[PDB]
Amino acid sequence: VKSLDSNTQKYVDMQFEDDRQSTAKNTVMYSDQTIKYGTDFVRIFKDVKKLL
């Protein structure tokens, strides 16, 4: 059987919309103090660690 790739980081990276049983996002609240689709410094640090 053709199985998925050994590394699954790419699968996590790709983006999808919400489906019928994921958490419902609240759009009438104030800010959650997050920049959505912003620069992720922790991911940058982990990537730099992976390249060493």
Partner: protein, 561 residues
């Protein structure tokens, strides 16, 4: 050498014609074995439009596509592609090892469902987004594959890497940087256990600093995805002149906010969101714009409701089909009807006239003890008017995507927004007002200000200003209560890989009879560095001479909507 007569043998699920359309190889072309193998099965990518994934995505996991060369004559090679399908695949038992109900609730690959690689990929992505487990080794491995009965078992191999998380994020908008530091424990229970998130976060820009504690239950009750969120925040915001990017450090207010809220999914594409918020605005020397009560405080108790419909395309970054609608209504309790004090005759009362002979009234010239005289102190009257905020707010947004010709996508956007007061003598509140023009920025500030994006113009340039001339407040921005925007964008993608998503766009916007802008831009999205967008916009309208504003440039990071 050239191809010839690609024939498909022994395939009954799909006809010959559809598979030939999927192959895209015509007789007479130059032979390219690499191209033939790539079209047959693009092993490089999991979402490639290849025949093996065409079969495997609907559950014929046992389908094998092999090529056999039959004849090579007249410098022409003939083929017979052979397909051996096999029975359909149905999941039987789905279990996870290496970690329970938290993981099982978020599985797309339910028992009894038709096999689909898209479901496995989605479950991998969702478990990765949970954050507890190592993103590189979320391994779906097949057990008890019985082609005799047409069944398949999946085990998810996972490795724990801790529940807690630290996050440093950044962005750019309104001509200023923005950044958050957050420590988020993604398991709280009533400690280890349920998926309840608790995060302590701090956000900062050049003119406002916010501290917040946020609790969030994704599955309220443990049955359906009802998000129950709560947030206690304290923010300090300066008087910021968005046009010139200077800040005054002696005019500042502190917003203390407590919000509870709930989002639930109803059709089935709709989301209903509710919120209850208490905000205390402690002003400090804020004699700017429409404010005259710069040393007082205000209280805001709001109930917010919202209905949203979302069925956009597969990629949130680059949708290619669908629509999104949003209607939101924010209401505060109507204190005016129950409070039996008159807001038109406040200015003619002894408790609101200017005072200092000691205790005398002043128009500064002493005007005796005549209570009808002197100047109606605007600070006291406005403070009594707005000690409890009274307003009603309605927002409507529509975003329709369509495909036009080829790979181009057209996006249409339309927003209306209104704010008012129940009693016209009370007046429209100076808070929660709409600010229009520029790079656009989300509701990072917790005072209700909404920066609406209109590229081609300076940041916060089109918001209305005091026009009284002799008021000594000419040029300062007071805010808009009604605003309408129509946007139309054409977008072409260059790459849609998981790592990088790049596209160019041309935009026409009209915002308020409106002010119009036209421009072009380029956006690049990566999971690490975020969503970087560069836009160049020419505005045909002026911000005395009726001359167009002309060119302007914006560079934004993050979804600044």
């Amino acid at each position: 050498y050239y191809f010839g007569n690609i024939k498909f043998l022994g395939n009954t699920v799909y006809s010959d014609q559809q598979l030939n359309r999927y192959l895209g190889i015509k007789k007479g072309e130059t032979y390219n074995g690499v191209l033939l193998e790539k079209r047959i099965a693009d092993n490089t990518k999991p979402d490639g439009e290849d025949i093996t994934n065409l079969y495997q995505n609907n559950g014929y996991l046992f389908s094998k596509i092999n090529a056999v060369e039959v004849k090579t004559v007249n410098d022409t090679i003939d083929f017979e592609i052979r397909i051996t399908e096999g029975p359909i695949a149905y999941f039987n038992k789905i279990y996870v090892t290496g970690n329970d109900h938290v993981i099982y609730r978020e599985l797309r690959t339910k028992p009894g469902n038709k096999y689909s690689k898209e479901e496995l990929v989605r479950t991998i992505r969702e478990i990765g987004q949970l954050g507890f487990f190592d993103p590189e080794s979320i391994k779906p491995e097949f057990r008890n594959v019985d082609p005799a009965a047409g069944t398949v078992d999946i085990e998810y191999q996972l490795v724990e890497k801790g529940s807690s998380q630290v996050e440093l994020q950044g962005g750019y908008g309104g001509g200023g940087f923005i950044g958050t530091l957050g420590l988020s424990f993604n398991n709280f229970s009533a400690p280890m256990g349920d998926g309840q998130k608790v995060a302590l976060r701090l956000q900062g820009s050049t003119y406002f600093q916010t501290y917040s504690l946020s609790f969030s239950e994704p599955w309220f009750g443990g049955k359906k995805p009802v998000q129950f969120s709560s947030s206690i925040s304290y923010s300090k915001q300066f008087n910021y002149n968005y046009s010139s990017r200077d800040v005054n450090r002696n005019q500042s207010f502190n917003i203390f906010t407590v919000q509870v809220g709930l989002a639930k999914r109803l059709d089935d594409y709709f989301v209903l969101s509710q919120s209850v918020s208490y905000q205390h605005y402690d002003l400090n020397n804020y004699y700017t714009g429409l404010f005259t009560f710069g040393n007082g405080a205000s209280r805001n108790l709001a109930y917010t409701i919202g209905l949203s419909r979302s069925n956009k395309g597969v990629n949130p970054i680059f949708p290619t089909y669908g629509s999104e609608f949003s209607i939101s209504a924010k209401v505060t309790p109507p204190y005016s009807l129950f409070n039996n004090i008159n807001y038109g005759d406040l200015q003619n009362q002894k408790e609101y006239k200017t005072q200092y002979n000691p205790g005398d009234y002043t128009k500064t010239v002493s005007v005796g003890s005549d209570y009808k005289s002197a100047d109606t102190d605007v600070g006291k009257v406005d403070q009594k008017k707005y000690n409890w905020l009274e307003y009603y707010k309605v927002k409507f947004k529509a975003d329709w995507y369509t495909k036009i010709y080829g790979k181009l996508v057209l996006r249409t956007l339309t927003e209306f927004g209104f704010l008012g007061a129940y009693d016209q003598s009370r007046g429209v509140v100076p808070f929660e007002r709409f600010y229009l023009g520029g790079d656009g920025m989300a509701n990072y500030s917790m005072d209700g200000r909404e920066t609406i994006q209109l590229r081609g113009y300076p940041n916060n340039s089109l918001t209305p200003i005091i026009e009284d001339r002799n008021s000594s407040r000419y040029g300062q921005q007071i805010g808009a209560t009604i605003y309408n925007k129509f946007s139309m964008e054409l977008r072409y993608p260059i790459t849609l890989k998981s790592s990088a998503s790049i596209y160019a766009l041309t935009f026409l916007e009209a915002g308020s009879d409106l002010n119009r802008s036209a421009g072009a831009g380029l956006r690049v999205f990566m999971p690490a560095f975020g969503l970087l967008g560069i836009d160049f916009g020419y505005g045909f309208d002026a911000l005395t001479t009726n001359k167009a504003n002309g060119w302007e440039t914006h560079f934004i990071i993050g979804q600044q909507f």
